[PDB]
Amino acid sequence: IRLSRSALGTAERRDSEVKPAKDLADIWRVINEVNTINLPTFALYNVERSQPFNRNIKDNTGRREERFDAYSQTLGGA
């Protein structure tokens, strides 16, 4: 998988080659929906962690109980 970007004000724009990642994640998602499987975990813990306080707002964001809530803001840094 290759991520590519061109600078501002450039006539020629470079594209990204992200198809194999889509294929692998499609395999994971389709197999999981047909029959439950174990899904990989992708997390990023950058400097944006260590923020003060906890449970700032009620955070109406999508029912933490459901399984695919584990991928929400998983690579945000905090």
For the CB of residue 78, give the shortest distance to a copy of itself in the complex, in Å. Answer: 10
Distances (CA, A) of 61 to 2, 42, 72: 31, 20, 9
**What is the contact surface with a copy of itself in residues (CB under 8 A)?**
47-48, 50-52
**Beta carbon nearer to a copy of itself, 22 or 73:** 73
For the CB of residue 57, give the shortest distance to a copy of itself in the complex, in Å. Answer: 18
Distances (CA, A) of 30 to 1, 3, 7, 20, 47: 20, 25, 37, 15, 35
**Beta carbon nearer to a copy of itself, 46 or 60:** 46
